[PDB]
């Protein structure tokens, strides 16, 4: 049931990156700055980045 934070759609799930800190997602093609591929390491969405210290 994951949708992209930017465009609010869940289509093209092969491009729909999942946050390692929560249930949120983002299409690599909606990401700014440019994200050409799904990263191998952990990715954190902006809501999770806001919880860091």
């Amino acid at each position: 049931k994951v949708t992209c934070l930017v465009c609010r759609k869940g289509d093209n799930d092969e491009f729909l990156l999942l946050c390692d800190g929560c249930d949120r997602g983002c299409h690599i093609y909606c990401h700014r700055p440019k994200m050409e591929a799904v990263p191998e390491g952990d990715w954190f969405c902006t809501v999770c980045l806001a919880q860091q210290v």
């Binding site: 994951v2 869940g10 799930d13 092969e14 491009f15 729909l16 990156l17 999942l18 390692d20 997602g25 799904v38 990263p39 191998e40 390491g41 952990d42 990715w43």
Partner: peptide, 8 residues
């Protein structure tokens, strides 16, 4: 990281 396709 992983995608919604690779998860399900």
């Amino acid at each position: 990281a992983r995608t919604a396709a690779t998860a399900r």
